[model samples]
Target: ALALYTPLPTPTGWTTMGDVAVGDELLGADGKPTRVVAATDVMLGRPCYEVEFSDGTVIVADAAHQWPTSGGIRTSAQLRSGADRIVVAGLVPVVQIESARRVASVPVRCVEVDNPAHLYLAGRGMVPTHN
Candidate 1:
């Protein structure tokens, strides 16, 4: 899952997870727009982590956030263990996975896409993320 404010690239421009709705189009792994099939309501108190990519992109997400890296789908928990690095959009590298922490209760949301890869781009770098 991701913080509700996480920015996702879309066909028209960037949109946040909280603002994204079903039927909206999001940039997929292939850099194409994919339709959102489902979305969850805002939930509070979910643990989140700060992840930094080698390309200088940083974002916050839950331990269960899915990342489609070179090896396949990896959870934030797995990545935080000093495992393989994630290459965003198959270019930018995920260099660091910071310790999990949450200062206060925050709303988080998750969405599902219809793209074949079941992944989408997030943050400024448009990194690939699984649904």
Candidate 2:
């Protein structure tokens, strides 16, 4: 797989990018949740989905890891624990609000993606929906 569709961690569980549809939601890198209003491309790049937060922050991600997990909630205690996110749960702000200032973007076209997740899922007509 080129840039496979990686799962984003959450209070509930892991979610996919192509699998992102309406009624679906996600937390920002800092632990803020946002619903899926629209999804365009799921390229074979690094990281995961291209999330558009509730407050209207679009954060472009880097590599190997794009989306973050709040498990539906990343609490203050978790941040205070000073441990890795995989070890705890809590809210992460700013990143949810100021994505441009946070997660750097690496723009790429999905038409050339090599990710099986995107190819397979989209192939199954799992394209993202807004309404």
Candidate that scores best on TM-score = 1
1-131, model 2: which lDDT tens digit per residue? 11224344333666554454554554432344445444556554343334333344332333332222333333222221222222122243222312222232344222212222211111111211111
lDDT of 1 by residue, 68-119 (tens): 6656677766664344566555355545443334445468889999987678
Cα lDDT of candidate 2 equals 0.31
TM-score of predicted structure 1:
0.82
TM-score of each: 0.82, 0.30
TM-score of 2: 0.30
Q: Which stretches of candidate 1 lie over 4 Å from their true place?
A: 80-83, 87-105
- Tell me the spans in candidate 2 whose CA falls farther than 4 Å from its real position: 1-4, 41-131
Residue 109 accuracy (lDDT) in model 2: 22
Q: How many pairs of residues collide in model 2? A: 10
- Residue 103 of model 2, lDDT score: 32
